[model samples]
Target chain A: MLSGLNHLTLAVSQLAPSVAFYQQLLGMTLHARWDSGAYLSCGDLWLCLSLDPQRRVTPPEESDYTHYAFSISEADFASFAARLEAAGVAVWKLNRSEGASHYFLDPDGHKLELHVGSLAQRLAACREQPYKGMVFF
Target chain B: MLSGLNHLTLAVSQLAPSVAFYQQLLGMTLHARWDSGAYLSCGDLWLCLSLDPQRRVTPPEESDYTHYAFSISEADFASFAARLEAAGVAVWKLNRSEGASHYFLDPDGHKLELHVGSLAQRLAACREQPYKGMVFF
Candidate 1:
């Protein structure tokens, strides 16, 4: 059987800026860096920002809620949002009733989030509403 | 500071089949299912399969090595490969000098991997070679 996620590798247009975004802004400790990619530790999990300057990453269309969310403490949600806003990172929010989620994008336009709750919490909140067929945030 | 990954939401063409693949083949436990998405547990992390039948999932071009990898024990690697092959899942592999990785596409063509070794281990191995400016696996 497989354990948890080992790492998530993303296609970044530039390595330096991406590294800065994850390292400086998100507080991920850089584990390794090369011209093509940088690996950082997000707690126990790892994130790889793989450079692919030639590839264009079109942002998902409106109403498209596809994204990857990282866990954050409830107490940290407010300050985290502030930090993201202070960094000039675009911050978006989902329904508070659902969960405290700060949705945003990386330098390469990969949709990401800082969520306050666990999977069970999010699922329970999502289920509190009518079966809308999809769960966002 | 931001914590580890909360959950990864993937837009899948079909929810049922994706759930089957994750739950049965990869040992992810289904937590909840709705018309639009299904949630599963991969150890402590959550994976959401969001249904979006309208979108087309094109295979990532050769250099598009963006993917998510899950860790598996060395003892489980061979059997995991065998199970995937037995199920007729398309399996791919990356070089081992960096790490042992088995790449495959989910039902919606989302690139995923089963890897052995931590980021530090891989980085050490990678640095042992001439820094090619990027590490993919």
Candidate 2:
């Protein structure tokens, strides 16, 4: 059985700026860097920034909902949103579900979210106000 | 500072089959499900499968290296590979990295990898034999 997420790799057109975005802006620790790629970490999450010239550098169509969400504390959520706005990051979506969420795009157009909530909390919220055909396991 | 990865949402064409693939084949725990989506967990990683009619269902081109990798124990690696092969899943790439890895495509053509090592181990290995222009931080 798969245990946990070891890492997530995202293709980037320019390595240096992408590294700076994740390391300086997002507060992820840069572990190692090479010519074509770099490894960074946030808590236990290892993120690989791979250089790929053919990668998509623009945001997906509005209908596409695939994204990666990073956890943030409730106390820091407001300030983080302000920082993102100050940095001119594009807000991709507004929060409509439980907890606070700021959906934004990275420099390379990868959709990402800073969310202040846990899975347990979301499950509890769903139990209280279920969606269509909701089921729990 | 960002804490960690809270969740990853992947747009799927078929919700039920995707749920089954993650729940049964990947051995993830299904926390909640609705008509359009489901939330599953593999250890601490929360995976959200969202139904999107306009999402890309085909795998990215060969030059694109973006992927999600899940950690598996070395003890269970061989058996898991056999299980995946028996299930008729397509192997997307062969392993050429530091640790054992099996890259395969999910039903929706999402690139997923089962790796048998941790970031700490990989960093240690890279220290012994660094890549081109390798820099440590």
- Runs in model 1 deviating more than 4 A are A62-64, A91-98, A123-130, A133-137, B133-137
Q: Give me the runs in candidate 2 sitting further than 4 Å from their true place.
A: B60-63
Tens-digit lDDT string for candidate 2 (A13-97): 9998899899988889999999999999998899999998977677646437889999999999999989989989888888998
Predicted candidate 2, C-alpha RMSD: 1.4
* TM-scores for chain B, listed for all candidates: 0.86, 0.93
Each candidate's fnat, listed in order, reads 0.68, 0.91
| Candidate 1 lDDT score relative to the true structure | 0.77
Lowest lDDT sum, 10 consecutive residues, model 2 chain B, at B55-64
Candidate 1 per-residue lDDT over residues B3-113, each given as its tens digit: 889888888777778888999888988877777778888887788777886546655554356688898998898899888989998755555556677888777667889
Instruction: Give each prediction's DockQ, rounded to 2 decimals.
Output: 0.52, 0.81
Interface RMSD of each: 4.7, 1.3
